[PDB]
């Protein structure tokens, strides 16, 4: 019995008991989320503790199979995903300290409030209050006050805490046969063992840098356009040759620019296309939206979903009683049980997110045949890419006319798709520089290039250099502005979104190129095209079994990240932006200072 | 006489795929219409004797095996098939002249909290020859060291089929009842008009 032949028996018992302990844990989590009650929380906690104990025991037992004697690629991948030491490499006291500091970071980000304005009687919670006050506001003073208050209340309490968290995570990564925590995070965009399709973390860094370098002009033109629009909206607040203040970038974090569409309408005389009125006029229920989405998926070529998806999964708000969480999530329980947890409303956004989660569900069914440890996207950027190509295909006006919701008498003029492209760019290309800047800053902080005593200055200088937004007020070294982000404070990788966009646009371009479509890229539709469905399903069924450098080529044709599909997707928008900012300044400079 | 087809099909409890149940049926009159008027089945792919000629032949001995498996593993109940059920649990001969009946039974074979009363053998030193039953809960020695009772490289062979009503089609219990028709040189015993 060779090592590769005993590896396979251990991995088989792991697969069986792990599938049982996940359907148990996932069912408990679903029961909690659908019905929040003390016994539900206790049951979910017990199931999670059992699952974590089983994972720890199996990880300890899997250390006896070295990877040097393993020849099969799938078995090697499963063992690599199972042999990770994780946070158990630290000392018991250090591990407990790390868990406690992560927990208090999460609980202080979640429970943070802004009682600074006026009297402490009105404590503005972040989720209902801060997002609402940052989505729309015509006063500079209130936005600046809220932004500064939140940033101060976060940094002044989490600066030493974040330093301790960084030190502990760096020590864990170093003890985990790695270089730093950024290297540990990048250790998932890594392929080694097969010739021709290989990847490295340094290769990932170089690829991200090159993609951003070749994507810079489009984002620069968009930034100039939005700066001019805000100058028109805001008198005497921005410099003609300087970066615009960060706190006006729609969302407070500046991650998404979707909220700036109100002040940046290319054509106010032509309203954006909406389906809410036609949907309520047709008396569409929460079930009909999913029925039509499933019909679209079947027309593409993907299979139907079982009655267990309809009877078990809940799609409507359960009323005042049985409180739940309205976070649209696609659940893969583990054993033929696929559910979506969302409160479907009669809106365009809910209609599109139904397809977005339904695509994740289709991905789950596609890779359900793979072993337990290979039931994921080839990297973290595949699931959301598939969901987003589903949303893009489902949002095309021709698909809306085909589904019968839109009136066939409606006509398309350049203003319509130019507004659609601007909205897509504000949603998509406006989050790439921010994601890249944040991930680079975290990578260099964990690596050690950025000194601990100099964090805020370098972060803001990077913000000027890459994103291009100035500080509304100078910040000293006793601040932890990046920690205000949910992903940074909760120990989450952020390159997922950059990778997601750069994969989704390649996927859409390749799929609709194989659908025999002639015309603009933004009007591409996968509906009623079995060839594109088969081409996508070939990659979908792979899961994490084969390297992402191969799965990307299997559907697109290239083994690396690309920007040309993203660039020519916004090609009409690119020409319009070029023709717009003629007399206005091009580019931003760091010479601006208050 | 009336063959005990109903008792085989109406049994309150069904066996596990590793310890499946065999019931020889003879000295009676075949009634396959009664078999038809039982339930709308999920599979009736029955190799060898055609269903039309079922009431037109005389098979010496009728064997009615019965067990509970998943929905995916019903396709492994057929000649020349491979898998955990067709190599260690229940293997059919290549010259299989009988009918494999298999309906869905998640209504009765689920407990909403894990119906671990149904087991299946996932590890075995050697494959299973046709129509062979092996019930031995001896720990399987995957490693190169003698087994002292569980621990590393010593796994319990039989793995339970944790059944729940919320499982999708394919993981729900499926009460499979094959109906083999063996023939010998002895005078015909089972005949039906
Ligand atoms: C056979 O089973 C059905 C339901 O499965 C039941 O209603 C009927 O009484 C059974 N026949 C008996 C027990 O003779
Ligand atoms: C087979 O069924 C009989 C009753 O029909 C029962 O007494 C016996 O224990 C069963 N054997 C197995 C292995 O299930």
PDB file of N, CA and C in Angstrom, chain B residues 55-109:
ATOM      1  N   UNK B  55     -46.119 -13.117 -17.727  1.00  0.00           N
ATOM      2  CA  UNK B  55     -47.242 -14.029 -17.506  1.00  0.00           C
ATOM      3  C   UNK B  55     -47.332 -15.075 -18.613  1.00  0.00           C
ATOM      4  N   UNK B  56     -46.207 -15.304 -19.298  1.00  0.00           N
ATOM      5  CA  UNK B  56     -46.195 -16.311 -20.365  1.00  0.00           C
ATOM      6  C   UNK B  56     -45.020 -17.274 -20.241  1.00  0.00           C
ATOM      7  N   UNK B  57     -44.362 -17.358 -19.088  1.00  0.00           N
ATOM      8  CA  UNK B  57     -43.221 -18.244 -18.906  1.00  0.00           C
ATOM      9  C   UNK B  57     -43.363 -18.948 -17.562  1.00  0.00           C
ATOM     10  N   UNK B  58     -42.397 -19.813 -17.259  1.00  0.00           N
ATOM     11  CA  UNK B  58     -42.380 -20.561 -16.001  1.00  0.00           C
ATOM     12  C   UNK B  58     -40.947 -20.571 -15.480  1.00  0.00           C
ATOM     13  N   UNK B  59     -40.674 -19.721 -14.489  1.00  0.00           N
ATOM     14  CA  UNK B  59     -39.350 -19.629 -13.876  1.00  0.00           C
ATOM     15  C   UNK B  59     -39.359 -20.462 -12.598  1.00  0.00           C
ATOM     16  N   UNK B  60     -38.376 -21.360 -12.500  1.00  0.00           N
ATOM     17  CA  UNK B  60     -38.281 -22.308 -11.395  1.00  0.00           C
ATOM     18  C   UNK B  60     -38.304 -21.620 -10.035  1.00  0.00           C
ATOM     19  N   UNK B  61     -37.326 -20.757  -9.776  1.00  0.00           N
ATOM     20  CA  UNK B  61     -37.217 -20.055  -8.506  1.00  0.00           C
ATOM     21  C   UNK B  61     -37.179 -18.553  -8.744  1.00  0.00           C
ATOM     22  N   UNK B  62     -37.906 -17.815  -7.913  1.00  0.00           N
ATOM     23  CA  UNK B  62     -37.927 -16.360  -7.968  1.00  0.00           C
ATOM     24  C   UNK B  62     -37.305 -15.820  -6.690  1.00  0.00           C
ATOM     25  N   UNK B  63     -36.302 -14.963  -6.852  1.00  0.00           N
ATOM     26  CA  UNK B  63     -35.592 -14.365  -5.731  1.00  0.00           C
ATOM     27  C   UNK B  63     -35.935 -12.887  -5.666  1.00  0.00           C
ATOM     28  N   UNK B  64     -36.451 -12.450  -4.524  1.00  0.00           N
ATOM     29  CA  UNK B  64     -36.884 -11.071  -4.328  1.00  0.00           C
ATOM     30  C   UNK B  64     -35.970 -10.423  -3.293  1.00  0.00           C
ATOM     31  N   UNK B  65     -34.852  -9.876  -3.761  1.00  0.00           N
ATOM     32  CA  UNK B  65     -33.973  -9.117  -2.891  1.00  0.00           C
ATOM     33  C   UNK B  65     -34.583  -7.749  -2.598  1.00  0.00           C
ATOM     34  N   UNK B  66     -34.190  -7.171  -1.466  1.00  0.00           N
ATOM     35  CA  UNK B  66     -34.768  -5.906  -1.036  1.00  0.00           C
ATOM     36  C   UNK B  66     -33.785  -5.187  -0.128  1.00  0.00           C
ATOM     37  N   UNK B  67     -33.554  -3.910  -0.410  1.00  0.00           N
ATOM     38  CA  UNK B  67     -32.630  -3.096   0.368  1.00  0.00           C
ATOM     39  C   UNK B  67     -32.965  -1.632   0.116  1.00  0.00           C
ATOM     40  N   UNK B  68     -32.268  -0.752   0.828  1.00  0.00           N
ATOM     41  CA  UNK B  68     -32.487   0.688   0.747  1.00  0.00           C
ATOM     42  C   UNK B  68     -31.159   1.342   0.396  1.00  0.00           C
ATOM     43  N   UNK B  69     -31.141   2.114  -0.691  1.00  0.00           N
ATOM     44  CA  UNK B  69     -29.942   2.826  -1.118  1.00  0.00           C
ATOM     45  C   UNK B  69     -30.297   4.266  -1.462  1.00  0.00           C
ATOM     46  N   UNK B  70     -29.311   5.021  -1.934  1.00  0.00           N
ATOM     47  CA  UNK B  70     -29.543   6.371  -2.414  1.00  0.00           C
ATOM     48  C   UNK B  70     -30.157   6.333  -3.811  1.00  0.00           C
ATOM     49  N   UNK B  71     -30.525   7.513  -4.311  1.00  0.00           N
ATOM     50  CA  UNK B  71     -31.030   7.601  -5.669  1.00  0.00           C
ATOM     51  C   UNK B  71     -29.951   7.498  -6.723  1.00  0.00           C
ATOM     52  N   UNK B  72     -28.753   8.009  -6.431  1.00  0.00           N
ATOM     53  CA  UNK B  72     -27.646   7.897  -7.376  1.00  0.00           C
ATOM     54  C   UNK B  72     -27.233   6.447  -7.573  1.00  0.00           C
ATOM     55  N   UNK B  73     -27.270   5.658  -6.511  1.00  0.00           N
ATOM     56  CA  UNK B  73     -26.779   4.288  -6.490  1.00  0.00           C
ATOM     57  C   UNK B  73     -27.777   3.284  -7.029  1.00  0.00           C
ATOM     58  N   UNK B  74     -28.989   3.694  -7.414  1.00  0.00           N
ATOM     59  CA  UNK B  74     -29.900   2.788  -8.110  1.00  0.00           C
ATOM     60  C   UNK B  74     -29.375   2.395  -9.479  1.00  0.00           C
ATOM     61  N   UNK B  75     -28.687   3.300 -10.169  1.00  0.00           N
ATOM     62  CA  UNK B  75     -28.088   3.011 -11.464  1.00  0.00           C
ATOM     63  C   UNK B  75     -26.962   1.992 -11.378  1.00  0.00           C
ATOM     64  N   UNK B  76     -26.453   1.716 -10.178  1.00  0.00           N
ATOM     65  CA  UNK B  76     -25.451   0.682  -9.978  1.00  0.00           C
ATOM     66  C   UNK B  76     -26.063  -0.694  -9.787  1.00  0.00           C
ATOM     67  N   UNK B  77     -27.385  -0.785  -9.654  1.00  0.00           N
ATOM     68  CA  UNK B  77     -28.058  -2.075  -9.584  1.00  0.00           C
ATOM     69  C   UNK B  77     -28.394  -2.508 -11.003  1.00  0.00           C
ATOM     70  N   UNK B  78     -27.407  -3.077 -11.693  1.00  0.00           N
ATOM     71  CA  UNK B  78     -27.530  -3.479 -13.088  1.00  0.00           C
ATOM     72  C   UNK B  78     -26.283  -4.261 -13.462  1.00  0.00           C
ATOM     73  N   UNK B  79     -26.381  -5.204 -14.398  1.00  0.00           N
ATOM     74  CA  UNK B  79     -25.192  -5.965 -14.801  1.00  0.00           C
ATOM     75  C   UNK B  79     -24.118  -5.060 -15.385  1.00  0.00           C
ATOM     76  N   UNK B  80     -22.865  -5.391 -15.089  1.00  0.00           N
ATOM     77  CA  UNK B  80     -21.737  -4.650 -15.613  1.00  0.00           C
ATOM     78  C   UNK B  80     -21.664  -3.210 -15.150  1.00  0.00           C
ATOM     79  N   UNK B  81     -21.859  -2.984 -13.853  1.00  0.00           N
ATOM     80  CA  UNK B  81     -21.774  -1.654 -13.270  1.00  0.00           C
ATOM     81  C   UNK B  81     -20.767  -1.665 -12.131  1.00  0.00           C
ATOM     82  N   UNK B  82     -20.192  -0.497 -11.859  1.00  0.00           N
ATOM     83  CA  UNK B  82     -19.151  -0.355 -10.854  1.00  0.00           C
ATOM     84  C   UNK B  82     -19.518   0.754  -9.878  1.00  0.00           C
ATOM     85  N   UNK B  83     -18.968   0.655  -8.683  1.00  0.00           N
ATOM     86  CA  UNK B  83     -19.247   1.611  -7.630  1.00  0.00           C
ATOM     87  C   UNK B  83     -19.128   0.946  -6.275  1.00  0.00           C
ATOM     88  N   UNK B  84     -19.490   1.711  -5.244  1.00  0.00           N
ATOM     89  CA  UNK B  84     -19.445   1.176  -3.888  1.00  0.00           C
ATOM     90  C   UNK B  84     -20.525   0.124  -3.668  1.00  0.00           C
ATOM     91  N   UNK B  85     -21.664   0.260  -4.347  1.00  0.00           N
ATOM     92  CA  UNK B  85     -22.779  -0.664  -4.180  1.00  0.00           C
ATOM     93  C   UNK B  85     -22.616  -1.865  -5.101  1.00  0.00           C
ATOM     94  N   UNK B  86     -21.905  -1.682  -6.212  1.00  0.00           N
ATOM     95  CA  UNK B  86     -21.770  -2.757  -7.183  1.00  0.00           C
ATOM     96  C   UNK B  86     -20.444  -3.498  -7.060  1.00  0.00           C
ATOM     97  N   UNK B  87     -19.595  -3.138  -6.105  1.00  0.00           N
ATOM     98  CA  UNK B  87     -18.336  -3.833  -5.891  1.00  0.00           C
ATOM     99  C   UNK B  87     -18.182  -4.399  -4.491  1.00  0.00           C
ATOM    100  N   UNK B  88     -18.872  -3.843  -3.500  1.00  0.00           N
ATOM    101  CA  UNK B  88     -18.772  -4.308  -2.125  1.00  0.00           C
ATOM    102  C   UNK B  88     -20.106  -4.682  -1.503  1.00  0.00           C
ATOM    103  N   UNK B  89     -21.213  -4.106  -1.971  1.00  0.00           N
ATOM    104  CA  UNK B  89     -22.510  -4.275  -1.325  1.00  0.00           C
ATOM    105  C   UNK B  89     -23.403  -5.284  -2.042  1.00  0.00           C
ATOM    106  N   UNK B  90     -23.683  -5.062  -3.325  1.00  0.00           N
ATOM    107  CA  UNK B  90     -24.647  -5.901  -4.039  1.00  0.00           C
ATOM    108  C   UNK B  90     -24.287  -5.896  -5.522  1.00  0.00           C
ATOM    109  N   UNK B  91     -23.724  -7.003  -5.996  1.00  0.00           N
ATOM    110  CA  UNK B  91     -23.351  -7.160  -7.394  1.00  0.00           C
ATOM    111  C   UNK B  91     -24.281  -8.162  -8.064  1.00  0.00           C
ATOM    112  N   UNK B  92     -24.823  -7.780  -9.247  1.00  0.00           N
ATOM    113  CA  UNK B  92     -25.674  -8.618 -10.075  1.00  0.00           C
ATOM    114  C   UNK B  92     -24.855  -9.313 -11.155  1.00  0.00           C
ATOM    115  N   UNK B  93     -25.207 -10.546 -11.508  1.00  0.00           N
ATOM    116  CA  UNK B  93     -24.460 -11.255 -12.550  1.00  0.00           C
ATOM    117  C   UNK B  93     -24.710 -10.649 -13.920  1.00  0.00           C
ATOM    118  N   UNK B  94     -23.760 -10.890 -14.825  1.00  0.00           N
ATOM    119  CA  UNK B  94     -23.910 -10.422 -16.197  1.00  0.00           C
ATOM    120  C   UNK B  94     -25.085 -11.086 -16.902  1.00  0.00           C
ATOM    121  N   UNK B  95     -25.391 -12.334 -16.564  1.00  0.00           N
ATOM    122  CA  UNK B  95     -26.524 -13.054 -17.132  1.00  0.00           C
ATOM    123  C   UNK B  95     -27.741 -12.897 -16.223  1.00  0.00           C
ATOM    124  N   UNK B  96     -28.105 -11.644 -15.968  1.00  0.00           N
ATOM    125  CA  UNK B  96     -29.184 -11.322 -15.040  1.00  0.00           C
ATOM    126  C   UNK B  96     -30.512 -11.360 -15.786  1.00  0.00           C
ATOM    127  N   UNK B  97     -31.324 -12.377 -15.500  1.00  0.00           N
ATOM    128  CA  UNK B  97     -32.664 -12.495 -16.071  1.00  0.00           C
ATOM    129  C   UNK B  97     -33.675 -12.296 -14.947  1.00  0.00           C
ATOM    130  N   UNK B  98     -33.996 -11.039 -14.689  1.00  0.00           N
ATOM    131  CA  UNK B  98     -34.942 -10.672 -13.649  1.00  0.00           C
ATOM    132  C   UNK B  98     -35.342  -9.229 -13.816  1.00  0.00           C
ATOM    133  N   UNK B  99     -36.167  -8.732 -12.895  1.00  0.00           N
ATOM    134  CA  UNK B  99     -36.548  -7.318 -12.951  1.00  0.00           C
ATOM    135  C   UNK B  99     -36.206  -6.577 -11.654  1.00  0.00           C
ATOM    136  N   UNK B 100     -35.577  -5.410 -11.825  1.00  0.00           N
ATOM    137  CA  UNK B 100     -35.146  -4.510 -10.760  1.00  0.00           C
ATOM    138  C   UNK B 100     -36.194  -3.435 -10.519  1.00  0.00           C
ATOM    139  N   UNK B 101     -36.977  -3.585  -9.451  1.00  0.00           N
ATOM    140  CA  UNK B 101     -37.958  -2.564  -9.114  1.00  0.00           C
ATOM    141  C   UNK B 101     -37.426  -1.691  -7.979  1.00  0.00           C
ATOM    142  N   UNK B 102     -37.529  -0.376  -8.166  1.00  0.00           N
ATOM    143  CA  UNK B 102     -36.967   0.560  -7.198  1.00  0.00           C
ATOM    144  C   UNK B 102     -37.762   1.857  -7.125  1.00  0.00           C
ATOM    145  N   UNK B 103     -38.586   2.012  -6.090  1.00  0.00           N
ATOM    146  CA  UNK B 103     -39.347   3.240  -5.926  1.00  0.00           C
ATOM    147  C   UNK B 103     -38.707   4.129  -4.860  1.00  0.00           C
ATOM    148  N   UNK B 104     -39.272   5.321  -4.696  1.00  0.00           N
ATOM    149  CA  UNK B 104     -38.816   6.263  -3.687  1.00  0.00           C
ATOM    150  C   UNK B 104     -39.562   6.039  -2.376  1.00  0.00           C
ATOM    151  N   UNK B 105     -38.813   6.107  -1.267  1.00  0.00           N
ATOM    152  CA  UNK B 105     -39.402   5.842   0.041  1.00  0.00           C
ATOM    153  C   UNK B 105     -38.894   6.794   1.118  1.00  0.00           C
ATOM    154  N   UNK B 106     -38.615   8.051   0.768  1.00  0.00           N
ATOM    155  CA  UNK B 106     -38.127   8.994   1.770  1.00  0.00           C
ATOM    156  C   UNK B 106     -39.198   9.301   2.810  1.00  0.00           C
ATOM    157  N   UNK B 107     -40.464   9.046   2.478  1.00  0.00           N
ATOM    158  CA  UNK B 107     -41.547   9.287   3.426  1.00  0.00           C
ATOM    159  C   UNK B 107     -41.421   8.384   4.648  1.00  0.00           C
ATOM    160  N   UNK B 108     -41.046   7.122   4.434  1.00  0.00           N
ATOM    161  CA  UNK B 108     -40.993   6.142   5.511  1.00  0.00           C
ATOM    162  C   UNK B 108     -39.590   5.894   6.046  1.00  0.00           C
ATOM    163  N   UNK B 109     -38.552   6.120   5.242  1.00  0.00           N
ATOM    164  CA  UNK B 109     -37.179   5.827   5.633  1.00  0.00           C
ATOM    165  C   UNK B 109     -36.395   7.090   5.981  1.00  0.00           C
TER     166      UNK B 109
END
